[PDB]
């Protein structure tokens, strides 16, 4: 460990927006933390990014203002960024920089960890099999998820995704309720939440919701407003992810990370790239943002020899309700699945307006079946899905021509669409439904058709369950 | 004559991408050829691309690899690439750079000519007057080609254009048999087939089919596999054009040159453009594609005081059915007329899939007529086109209306259409077809109808074959 006095320089050679270029620094370190002292005396921090001979550049996490070519000092610790982390972080609140904001004490660290963390060896990773209860009807049964499974939430401006996040974080539970309840109740879910580029109103809505739940015994909150500087957002997610790693792989608990507004992260990275004059990719975003999103989306899954788990549940906004926009596409190439909250459903006041049609959850493949959830599950979702798609086709054909050309089968499809939207989609504010109930509701929605119409269902299962 | 010994250097500042930058070059010359030597005694070649006083630049053909700062040597030849052009290559095969691949020796050429070539006197050009025998009924009957006429062949990726080209190679001839069999003994005809960027499988297909046909006494096969150097791709067409000009003019021949996959040629042009550090133009292709493609296309025609002609037939791989793509647009602009193929006909298992409805030959009216051939060929093609159009139209009306409202003449049109794709369009792989018997077949098809509705042809010429 380092056992030498710190070092200080004063040669400042320019400021280019959120960057500060400087000269005559001996033996610097790439990715090294720098402190700053202003003429007025305030303190600041930064990160060395570029290095070339004696000249080096940094990035002030809180912007540049009042800096001077000769009346500002800088200090090089000659060490990679080491963050503090303890189990005591539960129940606390902080800003992006990690300093307290809720009047509480300074951080009292249990250990120093690396911001970049480390690349986990894939062989230790245990493939998830548990299927987590969500309470939501659209996610359970149809696009379910697992413990350790990283799923995003696609949404847009003005959509009510915030309370969807509230619901999914509040109604967390396990679906293995068919056994003794006492051993079931031992399990809880530590939550770590990292606001980022989020206005005051949504932040207070979330903290009031958490206070209503009374779950601050196991909630860590990192906060960011709009008025704060922008470059904090470059490092804000990583702090939360590292703390989640420590709370999972060392404290043995089950953690659930929440990330907010990744398009803001992309915007901040693009701003840094615009300052850094590197080669721009499509829509001006740097080429290596793919690898950056990879590095921030891989800290998930459980590991051998332990029993904790890490589930990634980010939310991101699509400008102009676009799907081929860069950030949605690249996130689709990193994350395994999608949800696609839709504006059209929200226009007719259906809450939550979850569009099942473009959704996907690959890891449903082995997360369901006899013993896990129910003998007869997947084909029900497939039949409902194909019926929904064909019903939407019939709806389009009705729009093009009119009800005159529709057959009786088309009428059956249309009433299926109506009932499907009315019952299965619409749930309500705090309607915590069970898995068996949603399966029963699916069977109910299937009942309207006779045996002949269904095509993607085994006849044995139909004879087993349909006649009741 | 070059009486100046060659110069070999050893100093080099470095290299850059696939190029090679050195210094202290005594009197560099643009487009100068050079050989290279590696530490392990490996020999390569190159061409000079940029010059600035003593700082020369050269692209290595084989591909930069294992190059050392000091233990490498270049050796200038002091001259642009010099084609070993001559008459005796017929019956030989060469690779990209002309090195023999048929187990032959270095060509003992009697002439050394510039690879790039020169333009022709626009004053010295003749109007084409005869036709060329192709052997495909759909080609000669509808869109017969002339001496000097330039016709491309549009085709989608994954169609049997290559096999059609090979058939045209092994089938193309003259039409002197019409005047007299004895006159055909003046076999001045020749073929020059150049394939670029083609998978080894179809290159083997070409060479095996040629060797089977046993007609390489009048063939010049250039071949360039896909894995070969990118630079050599833009070299082969110039060599082929030089040899074709030599045969057609200096050896008074009638040479049918054919070129394949100019889309990949455009990609090679893009490669060199990227190497040139010139900003790309529309759709990424360089803005000077026009001049290069024009210099490639225009090397043909007949000349005064000469007995010979050149006829070019390129094959363009239409990207994803995009008529508005720049390459096909400009190729249509330069050349005269076009011929289309169809995916649906290929799906119908009718070979060759040639669509004559949009096909058009520019100057067919003078390529055909009495004296050159039978007098009423153009009349017959016009009749077949009009009848095909009427048959397609009545079939389209049919498909929604019904046979209940169909008249006998329309049944005759349907029969003619069906027999037409069954027989005339259908060719088969090894069916040597001549113009006279194709005319007989067309007459037999036309004889299904009486004279009443065969209106477009005067009766004075209908008496020639209708009453048979």
């Amino acid at each position: 460990y380092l056992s030498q006095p710190r070092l200080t320089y004063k040669t400042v050679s320019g400021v280019n927006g959120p960057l500060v270029i400087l000269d005559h620094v001996k033996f610097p370190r790439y990715a090294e933390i720098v402190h700053l002292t202003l003429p007025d005396g305030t303190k600041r921090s930064g990160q060395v990014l570029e290095v070339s001979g004696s000249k080096a550049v940094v990035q002030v996490f809180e912007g540049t203002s009042g800096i001077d070519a000769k009346k500002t000092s800088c200090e090089f610790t000659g060490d990679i960024l080491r963050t503090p982390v303890s189990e005591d972080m539960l129940g606390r609140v902080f800003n992006g920089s990690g300093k307290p904001i809720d009047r509480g004490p300074v951080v009292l660290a249990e250990d120093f960890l690396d911001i970049m963390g480390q690349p986990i060896n894939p062989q230790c990773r245990i493939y998830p099999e548990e299927m987590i209860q969500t309470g939501i009807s659209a996610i359970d049964g149809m696009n379910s998820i697992a413990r350790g499974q990283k799923i995003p939430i696609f949404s847009a401006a003005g959509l009510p995704h915030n309370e969807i996040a509230a619901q999914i974080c509040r109604q967390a539970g396990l679906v293995k309720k068919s056994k003794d309840v006492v051993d079931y109740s031992e399990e809880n879910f530590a939550i770590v939440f990292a606001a980022m580029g989020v206005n005051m109103e949504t932040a207070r809505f979330f903290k009031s919701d958490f206070e209503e739940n009374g779950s601050m015994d196991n909630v860590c909150l990192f906060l960011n407003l709009a008025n704060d500087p922008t470059i904090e957002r470059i490092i804000t997610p990583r702090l939360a992810l590292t703390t989640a790693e420590f709370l999972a792989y060392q404290c043995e608990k089950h953690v659930l990370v929440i990330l907010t507004d990744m398009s803001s992260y992309a915007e901040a990275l693009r701003e840094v790239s615009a300052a850094r004059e590197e080669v721009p990719g499509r829509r001006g975003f740097p080429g290596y943002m793919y690898t950056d999103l990879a590095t921030i989306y891989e800290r998930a899954g459980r590991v051998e020899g332990r029993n904790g788990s890490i589930t990634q549940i980010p939310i991101l906004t699509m400008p102009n309700d676009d799907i081929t926009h860069p950030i949605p596409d690249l996130t689709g190439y990193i994350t395994e699945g999608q949800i696609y909250v839709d504006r059209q459903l929200h226009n007719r006041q259906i809450y939550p307006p979850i569009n099942v049609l473009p959704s996907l959850s690959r890891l449903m493949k082995s997360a369901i079946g006899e013993g896990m959830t129910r003998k007869d599950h997947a084909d029900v979702s497939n039949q409902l899905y194909a019926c929904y798609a064909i019903g939407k086709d019939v709806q389009a054909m009705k729009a093009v021509v009119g009800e005159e050309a529709l057959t009786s089968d088309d009428l059956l499809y249309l009433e299926f669409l109506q009932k499907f939207e009315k019952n299965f989609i619409t749930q309500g504010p705090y309607e915590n439904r069970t898995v068996y109930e949603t399966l029963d509701i699916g069977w109910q929605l299937l009942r309207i058709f006779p045996k002949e119409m269904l095509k993607r269902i085994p006849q044995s299962t139909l004879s087993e369950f349909y006649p009741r | 004559y070059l009486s100046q010994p060659r110069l070999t250097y050893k100093t080099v500042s470095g290299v850059n991408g696939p190029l090679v930058i050195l210094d202290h070059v005594k009197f560099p010359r643009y487009a100068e050829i050079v050989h290279l030597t590696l530490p392990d005694g490996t020999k390569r070649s190159g061409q000079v691309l940029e010059v600035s006083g003593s700082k020369a630049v050269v692209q290595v053909f084989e591909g930069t690899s294992g190059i050392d700062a000091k233990k490498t040597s270049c050796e200038f030849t002091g001259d642009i690439l010099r084609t070993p052009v001559s008459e005796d290559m017929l019956g030989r095969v060469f690779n990209g750079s002309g090195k023999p691949i048929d187990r032959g020796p270095v060509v003992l050429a009697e002439d050394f000519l510039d690879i790039m070539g020169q333009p022709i006197n626009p004053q010295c050009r003749i109007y084409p007057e005869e036709m060329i025998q192709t052997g495909i009924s759909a080609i000669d009957g509808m869109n017969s080609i002339a001496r000097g006429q330039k016709i491309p062949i549009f085709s989608a990726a994954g169609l049997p254009h290559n096999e059609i080209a090979a058939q045209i190679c092994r089938q193309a001839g003259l039409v002197k048999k019409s005047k007299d069999v004895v006159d055909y003994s003046e076999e001045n005809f020749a073929i020059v087939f150049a394939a670029m960027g083609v998978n080894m499988e179809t290159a083997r297909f070409f060479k095996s089919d040629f060797e089977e046909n046993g007609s390489m006494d009048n063939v010049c096969l250039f071949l360039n596999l896909a894995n070969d150097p990118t630079i050599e791709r833009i070299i082969t067409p110039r060599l082929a054009l030089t040899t074709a000009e030599f045969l057609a003019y200096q050896c008074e021949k009638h040479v049918l040159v054919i070129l394949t996959d100019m889309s990949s040629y455009a990609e090679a042009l893009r490669e060199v453009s990227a190497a040139r550090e010139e900003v790309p133009g529309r759709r990424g292709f360089p803005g000077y594609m026009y001049t290069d493609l024009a210099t490639i296309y225009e090397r043909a025609g007949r000349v005064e005081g000469r007995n010979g002609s050149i006829t070019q037939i390129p094959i363009l791989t239409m990207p994803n059915d995009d008529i508005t793509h720049p390459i096909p647009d400009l190729t249509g602009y330069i050349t005269e007329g076009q011929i289309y193929v169809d995916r649906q006909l290929h799906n119908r298992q009718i070979y060759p899939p040639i669509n004559v409805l949009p096909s058009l030959s520019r100057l067919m009216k003078s390529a055909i007529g009495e004296g050159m051939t039978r007098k009423d060929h153009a009349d017959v093609s016009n009749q077949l086109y009009a009848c095909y159009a009427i048959g397609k139209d009545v079939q389209a009306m049919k498909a929604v209306v019904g046979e209940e409202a169909l008249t006998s003449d329309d049944l005759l049109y349907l029969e003619f259409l069906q027999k037409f794709e069954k027989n005339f369009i259908t060719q088969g792989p090894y069916e040597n077809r001549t113009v006279y018997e194709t005319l007989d077949i067309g007459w037999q098809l036309l004889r299904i109808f009486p004279k009443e509705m065969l209106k477009r042809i005067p009766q004075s010429t209908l008496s020639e074959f209708y009453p048979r």
């Binding site: 004059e277 080669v279 721009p280 001006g284 | 550090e277 900003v279 790309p280």
Partner: peptide, 18 residues
């Protein structure tokens, strides 16, 4: 195209530093 032109010019002027 404009963005690529701008960065190419930037690289060029950087090249003529000496």
């Amino acid at each position: 195209f404009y963005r690529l032109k701008k960065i190419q010019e930037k690289k060029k002027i950087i090249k003529e530093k000496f």
